[PDB]
Amino acid sequence: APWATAEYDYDAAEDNELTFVENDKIINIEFVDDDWWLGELEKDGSKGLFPSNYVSLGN
């Protein structure tokens, strides 16, 4: 799946959101939702919905 990088220290506002800190790499991205995609952190392997606007897609 697509991948993305974090641009802001995101602290998952709703619980089942993902959480990352700037320059954080995200992978295995999916289009679970138009606005919140799902991830997998390449650095730690964490998955969760994230507000695509808090991150930039590397694809």
């Binding site: 802001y8 998952a12 506002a13 138009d34 606005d35 919905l49 507000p51 606007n53």
Partner: peptide, 18 residues
């Protein structure tokens, strides 16, 4: 806390715990 991060926009209500 952070000072410079977008506001996590709405969330499709079908993607919440439980």
């Amino acid at each position: 806390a952070k000072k410079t991060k977008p506001t996590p926009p709405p969330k499709p209500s079908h993607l919440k715990p439980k």
